[PDB]
Write a protein that binds this ligand. Structure first.
Ligand SMILES: *[C@@H]1O[C@H](CO)[C@@H](O)[C@H](O)[C@H]1NC(C)=O
Lengths: 49, 98, 35, 49
């Protein structure tokens, strides 16, 4: 549950170069596939189990 | 040897099959972004916001739309599959006779 | 990749491309040597 | 102390804070408490802009 965004999956460190304003990424199915952690500001990838 | 090496459109018949199938799948996935009249296209948003009675209404809307999308996909694949089978039957005949 | 993530998968062909090439070369060898 | 007339209703914007909605919902003091688009028991799990 990331700042209200809920789901299930495996979290890993991401190589995605988010700009400071960007909080999350999305795929073509309108599913979040990456988030910024609200406390550490680290970018995480989200993949299904 | 030389013609195939200098003609970008030479294998259009095979590329068209690849393109048609890719397009159908991309369309199917993109339909998951549709609301179909629901408050959200995201099932997790609905479940995190509403209790089961109100949630069942919103979910039913997504089920209806998503089932229709999948049925459309499958029907198109069956029709396309028949066309490919006819082509394969012709190819098999040419293998035998040519 | 993201298709898999939504329940969409691709099943591999029973015959690999190597195997199809083997069939093709057998047909060519047959034709060339025995008409 | 003073409430507005309905034709000239007041509006306050709330942001950048922690919202505990259970203290209101579990109160004995309100004759009406009706939620739309959201269930009151889930409000404490949610984030809003
Ligand atoms: C609180 O969050 C901020 C980022 O918004 C971070 O820089 C800070 O270190 C966090 N504080 C603690 C104690 O983790």
């Amino acid at each position: 549950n990331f700042n209200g965004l809920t789901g299930t999956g495996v979290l890993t460190e991401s190589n995605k170069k988010f700009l400071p304003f960007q909080q999350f990424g999305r795929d073509i199915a309108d599913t979040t596939d990456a988030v910024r952690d609200p406390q550490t500001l680290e970018i995480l990838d989200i993949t299904p189990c | 040897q030389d013609s195939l090496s200098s003609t970008p459109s030479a294998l259009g018949k095979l590329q068209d099959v690849v393109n048609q199938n890719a397009q159908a799948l991309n369309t199917l996935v993109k339909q998951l972004s549709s609301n179909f009249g629901a408050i959200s296209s995201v099932l997790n948003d609905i479940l995190s916001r509403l209790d089961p009675p109100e949630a069942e209404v919103q979910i039913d809307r997504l089920i209806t739309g998503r089932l229709q999308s999948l049925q459309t996909y499958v029907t198109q694949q069956l029709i396309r599959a028949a066309e490919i089978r006819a082509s394969a039957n012709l190819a098999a005949t040419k293998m035998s006779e040519c | 990749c993201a298709q898999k993530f939504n329940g969409l998968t691709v099943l591999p062909p029973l015959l690999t491309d190597e195997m199809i090439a083997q069939y093709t070369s057998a047909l060519l060898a047959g034709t060339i040597t025995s008409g | 102390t003073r409430f507005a007339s309905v034709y000239a209703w007041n509006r306050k914007r709330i942001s950048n804070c922690v919202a505990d909605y259970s203290v209101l919902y579990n109160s004995a003091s309100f004759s009406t408490f009706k939620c739309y688009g959201v269930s009151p028991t889930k409000l404490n799990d949610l984030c809003f802009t």
